[PDB]
Design a protein around this motif. Structure first.
Motif, short mmCIF file in Angstrom:
data_model
loop_
_atom_site.label_atom_id
_atom_site.label_comp_id
_atom_site.label_asym_id
_atom_site.label_seq_id
_atom_site.Cartn_x
_atom_site.Cartn_y
_atom_site.Cartn_z
N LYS A 126 0.82 -1.22 0.00
CA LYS A 126 0.00 0.00 0.00
C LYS A 126 0.85 1.28 0.00
O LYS A 126 0.56 2.17 -0.79
CB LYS A 126 -1.01 -0.05 1.16
N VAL A 127 1.93 1.37 0.79
CA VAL A 127 2.83 2.55 0.74
C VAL A 127 3.53 2.68 -0.62
O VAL A 127 3.68 3.79 -1.12
CB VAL A 127 3.86 2.65 1.90
N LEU A 128 3.89 1.56 -1.25
CA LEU A 128 4.52 1.56 -2.58
C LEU A 128 3.52 1.90 -3.71
O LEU A 128 3.88 2.57 -4.67
CB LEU A 128 5.23 0.21 -2.81
N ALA A 129 2.24 1.52 -3.57
CA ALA A 129 1.17 1.96 -4.46
C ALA A 129 0.85 3.46 -4.29
O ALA A 129 0.67 4.18 -5.27
CB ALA A 129 -0.07 1.08 -4.21
N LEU A 130 0.86 3.96 -3.05
CA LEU A 130 0.71 5.39 -2.75
C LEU A 130 1.91 6.21 -3.25
O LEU A 130 1.72 7.32 -3.73
CB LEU A 130 0.49 5.57 -1.24
N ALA A 131 3.13 5.65 -3.24
CA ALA A 131 4.31 6.29 -3.83
C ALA A 131 4.15 6.54 -5.35
O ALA A 131 4.58 7.58 -5.85
CB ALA A 131 5.54 5.44 -3.52
N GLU B 217 12.24 9.71 -1.69
CA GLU B 217 11.25 10.76 -1.48
C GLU B 217 9.80 10.29 -1.68
O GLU B 217 8.96 10.53 -0.81
CB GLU B 217 11.55 11.92 -2.47
N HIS B 218 9.50 9.61 -2.78
CA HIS B 218 8.15 9.15 -3.09
C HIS B 218 7.74 7.97 -2.21
O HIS B 218 6.58 7.88 -1.83
CB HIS B 218 8.03 8.81 -4.58
N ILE B 219 8.69 7.11 -1.82
CA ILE B 219 8.45 6.03 -0.84
C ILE B 219 8.18 6.62 0.56
O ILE B 219 7.22 6.20 1.21
CB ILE B 219 9.61 5.01 -0.84
N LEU B 220 8.94 7.63 1.00
CA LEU B 220 8.68 8.32 2.27
C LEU B 220 7.32 9.05 2.25
O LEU B 220 6.56 8.98 3.21
CB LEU B 220 9.84 9.29 2.58
N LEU B 221 6.99 9.70 1.14
CA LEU B 221 5.71 10.38 0.94
C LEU B 221 4.52 9.39 0.87
O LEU B 221 3.46 9.64 1.44
CB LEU B 221 5.86 11.27 -0.30
N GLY B 222 4.73 8.22 0.26
CA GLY B 222 3.78 7.10 0.26
C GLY B 222 3.53 6.53 1.66
O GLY B 222 2.38 6.22 2.00
N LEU B 223 4.56 6.45 2.51
CA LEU B 223 4.45 6.08 3.93
C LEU B 223 3.51 7.02 4.71
O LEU B 223 2.54 6.54 5.29
CB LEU B 223 5.86 6.05 4.57
N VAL B 224 3.74 8.34 4.69
CA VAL B 224 2.86 9.28 5.42
C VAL B 224 1.45 9.36 4.84
O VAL B 224 0.49 9.57 5.58
CB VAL B 224 3.44 10.71 5.56
N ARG B 225 1.28 9.13 3.53
CA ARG B 225 -0.04 9.02 2.87
C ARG B 225 -0.80 7.75 3.27
O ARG B 225 -2.03 7.74 3.18
CB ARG B 225 0.14 9.13 1.35
N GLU B 226 -0.11 6.72 3.76
CA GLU B 226 -0.74 5.55 4.39
C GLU B 226 -1.14 5.91 5.84
O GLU B 226 -2.30 5.78 6.22
CB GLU B 226 0.20 4.34 4.30
N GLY B 227 -0.18 6.43 6.61
CA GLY B 227 -0.38 7.05 7.92
C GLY B 227 -0.64 6.11 9.12
O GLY B 227 -0.47 6.55 10.25
N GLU B 228 -1.00 4.84 8.91
CA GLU B 228 -1.32 3.88 9.98
C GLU B 228 -0.24 2.80 10.14
O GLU B 228 -0.01 2.33 11.26
CB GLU B 228 -2.73 3.31 9.75
N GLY B 229 0.46 2.43 9.06
CA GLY B 229 1.59 1.50 9.09
C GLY B 229 2.66 1.89 10.13
O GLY B 229 2.86 3.07 10.41
N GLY C 101 8.07 -5.34 5.85
CA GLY C 101 7.01 -4.49 6.40
C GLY C 101 7.20 -3.00 6.11
O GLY C 101 8.24 -2.58 5.58
N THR C 102 6.23 -2.16 6.49
CA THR C 102 6.35 -0.69 6.43
C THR C 102 7.52 -0.20 7.28
O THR C 102 8.32 0.63 6.84
CB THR C 102 5.06 0.03 6.90
N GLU C 103 7.68 -0.79 8.46
CA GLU C 103 8.81 -0.68 9.37
C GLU C 103 10.15 -0.87 8.63
O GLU C 103 11.01 0.01 8.66
CB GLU C 103 8.64 -1.68 10.54
N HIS C 104 10.30 -1.98 7.90
CA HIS C 104 11.52 -2.31 7.16
C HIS C 104 11.76 -1.39 5.97
O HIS C 104 12.92 -1.07 5.70
CB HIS C 104 11.47 -3.78 6.74
N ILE C 105 10.71 -0.89 5.29
CA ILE C 105 10.84 0.17 4.27
C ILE C 105 11.51 1.41 4.87
O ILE C 105 12.49 1.90 4.30
CB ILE C 105 9.48 0.51 3.61
N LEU C 106 11.06 1.89 6.04
CA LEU C 106 11.69 3.04 6.70
C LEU C 106 13.13 2.73 7.11
O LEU C 106 14.01 3.54 6.82
CB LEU C 106 10.83 3.53 7.86
N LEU C 107 13.41 1.54 7.68
CA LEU C 107 14.79 1.13 7.97
C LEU C 107 15.68 1.14 6.70
O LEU C 107 16.84 1.54 6.78
CB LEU C 107 14.83 -0.23 8.69
N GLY C 108 15.13 0.80 5.53
CA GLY C 108 15.79 0.95 4.23
C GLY C 108 16.06 2.42 3.84
O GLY C 108 17.17 2.73 3.42
#
Length: 145
Positions: A12-17, A32-44, A104-111
Motif C-alpha cells: 500500500k505505501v509503494l502503491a501510494l508512492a 522521497e516518493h516512498i517516504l511520501l507514500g508512507l505518510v499518505r498511508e499514515g497507519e503503518g 514491512g512498512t517498518e523495514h521500508i523506513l529502515l531501508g
C-alpha cells in the motif's frame, strides 16, 4: 529461497508512492516518493513511528515537495530510481537481519535511513529525526512497545 515479498501494508505505501509521483507530475519513484507514500498511508508502523517522533504528513510532504518540485510529467508510467531500487534491496536486508520472511512498512523506513543520502534521509534530518531515533521507535513499535 529469499524474502522477495512485501506485506499488504507495505505494498500500500509503494502503491501510494506511485499515486504521489503522478500527483507531483513525476514518472518515477525516488526515496522521497516512498517516504511520501508512507505518510499518505499514515497507519503503518513506520508512519506511526514518524508521528511518534513528532512529525506529521504535511511536514514531510512540504519538505519532500520543496526539495524535488513538480511538473516533469510525460504520461510514461512509473520507474524506480537507483536509490529507490537500493531502498527496496536495503529494506529487504533489514527484514532478513530481523528474521522477518517479508518486508514491512517498518523495514521500508529502515531501508530509507540505511540509504542515508537520498531525499528521504535529508527530509528526516532537516525536520529533526535521525538514524538511531527512527531505528529505536520502529524497532520498538513493530511489536516490542
Amino acid at each position: 529461497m529469499m524474502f522477495g515479498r512485501f506485506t499488504e501494508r507495505a505494498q500500500k505505501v509503494l502503491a501510494l508512492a506511485q499515486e504521489e509521483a503522478l500527483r507531483l507530475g513525476h514518472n518515477n519513484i525516488g526515496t522521497e516518493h516512498i517516504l511520501l507514500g508512507l505518510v499518505r498511508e499514515g497507519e503503518g508502523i513506520a508512519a506511526k513511528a514518524l508521528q511518534a517522533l513528532g512529525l506529521g504528513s504535511e511536514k514531510i510532504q512540504k519538505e519532500v515537495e520543496s526539495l524535488i518540485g513538480r511538473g516533469q510529467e510525460m504520461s510514461q508510467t512509473i520507474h524506480y530510481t537507483p536509490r529507490a531500487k537500493k531502498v527496496i534491496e536495503l529494506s529487504m536486508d533489514e527484514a532478513r537481519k530481523l528474521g522477518h520472511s517479508y518486508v514491512g512498512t517498518e523495514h521500508i523506513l529502515l531501508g530509507l535511513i540505511r540509504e542515508g543520502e537520498g531525499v528521504a534521509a535529508r527530509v528526516l534530518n532537516n525536520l529533526g529525526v535521525s538514524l538511531n531515533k527512527a531505528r529505536q521507535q520502529v524497532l520498538q513499535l513493530l511489536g516490542s512497545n
